Amino acid sequence: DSCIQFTRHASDVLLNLNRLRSRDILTDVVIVVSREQFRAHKTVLMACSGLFYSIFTDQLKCNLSVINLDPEINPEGFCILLDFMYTSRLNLREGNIMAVMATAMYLQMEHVVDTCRKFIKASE
Amino acid sequence: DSCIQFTRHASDVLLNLNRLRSRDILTDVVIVVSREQFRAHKTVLMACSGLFYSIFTDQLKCNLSVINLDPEINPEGFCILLDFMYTSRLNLREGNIMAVMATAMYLQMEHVVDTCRKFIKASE
Amino acid sequence: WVIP
Amino acid sequence: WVIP
Ligand SMILES: O=C1Cc2cc(Nc3ncncc3Cl)ccc2N1
Ligand SMILES: O=C1Cc2cc(Nc3ncncc3Cl)ccc2N1
Numbered sequence: 001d002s003c004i005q006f007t008r009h010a011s012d013v014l015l016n017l018n019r020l021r022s023r024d025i026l027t028d029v030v031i032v033v034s035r036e037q038f039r040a041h042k043t044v045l046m047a048c049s050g051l052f053y054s055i056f057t058d059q060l061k062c063n064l065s066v067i068n069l070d071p072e073i074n075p076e077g078f079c080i081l082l083d084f085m086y087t088s089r090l091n092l093r094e095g096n097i098m099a100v101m102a103t104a105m106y107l108q109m110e111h112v113v114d115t116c117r118k119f120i121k122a123s124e
Numbered sequence: 125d126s127c128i129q130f131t132r133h134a135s136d137v138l139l140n141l142n143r144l145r146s147r148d149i150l151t152d153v154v155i156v157v158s159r160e161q162f163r164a165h166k167t168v169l170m171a172c173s174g175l176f177y178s179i180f181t182d183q184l185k186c187n188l189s190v191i192n193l194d195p196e197i198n199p200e201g202f203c204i205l206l207d208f209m210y211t212s213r214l215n216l217r218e219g220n221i222m223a224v225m226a227t228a229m230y231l232q233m234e235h236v237v238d239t240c241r242k243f244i245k246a247s248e
Numbered sequence: 249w250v251i252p
Numbered sequence: 253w254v255i256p
């Protein structure tokens with residue numbers, strides 16, 4: 001086509017979605033991790049994670065307001081990944097890298113799994 | 125902080141939100157324009173438009189599944205702006221620029237109003 | 249704004 | 253990935 005494109009549009013949209021999350025506006029699901037609860041928007045979770053995409057396209061699960069993750073999932077690793085989904089920023093540290101990679105593998109967040117693998121390989 | 129950032133994350137999120145719109149997945153509102161209906165996600169509409177932000181933060185309107193726009197709004201101008209919201213691409217043409225700018229002013233999409241004003245000024 |  |  002003959003479209004023009006606004007370079008900062010996608011980043012501005014994600015920044016606003018994160019502002020709605022902060023203020024708990026139109027959040028439609030609670031993710032439960034080892035008795036730690038995280039409110040979010042189903043569509044953002046689906047846009048970022050192969051696991052949530054599969055969950056919320058399922059005819060029965062699409063209607064659930066509460067999703068319980070596998071008990072092996074670490075709440076801090078989940079929190080870091082939820083922050084990444086809404087900001088593009090990943091708080092990757094020596095002390096959390098193993099939990100973050102394990103959570104990203106479970107959530108099916110391929111780009112995060114990739115950078116964790118590379119950061120672990122650099123330290124060996 | 126000491127975060128790393130994935131450059132393409134925001135664009136990938138918006139691309140996936142547009143794929144959900146195309147497949148009519150988790151769309152939660154119908155926007156009615158001069159008897160033309162457009163399905164969308166409330167959160168994306170709020171993230172892009174000052175008007176939708178005001179509508180869906182209102183305690184009564186946040187619960188509506190149908191929103192009727194002012195009868196002066198042109199369905200084609202709305203369609204072009206809805207496409208921009210989900211893609212960052214604006215199909216601005218000599219034949220639609222007036223309707224697009226009028227719709228962007230009503231929707232409170234300041235960056236679109238800005239480029240329309242500049243494109244109109246170049247033609248005078 | 250840019251030409252994509 | 254970059255340093256923001
Ligand atoms: O690593 C990843 C990230 C990711 C996101 C999604 N999401 C969607 N894919 C396609 N159309 C719509 C959506 Cl919402 C699916 C798989 C994966 N895998
Ligand atoms: O031009 C524009 C675009 C736009 C978007 C919004 N959206 C939000 N603002 C702040 N926190 C959350 C959201 Cl969702 C408000 C006003 C305007 N004006």
Ligand SMILES: [Cl-]
Binds near residue numbers: 048110111
């Ligand atoms: Cl990812």
Ligand SMILES: [Cl-]
Binds near residue numbers: 234237
């Ligand atoms: Cl805009």
